[PDB]
Design a protein around this ligand. Sequence first.
Ligand SMILES: [Cl-]
Length: 61
Amino acid sequence: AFGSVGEWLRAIKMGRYEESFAAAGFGSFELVSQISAEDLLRIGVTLAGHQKKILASVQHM
Ligand SMILES: [Cl-]
């Protein structure tokens, strides 16, 4: 378990997206667990490799 979405993003080397997750309203794991590729694109994860890494990480929840 992570203490916050930030801690999670940081842990999976995706800390660069912290502010953009938070501003888009993804501040709980309940929301992030339902995240899709379209969501990731909307908030600014433009790289498919980062999208894949993020989505593979959430598929654990
Ligand atoms: Cl934090």
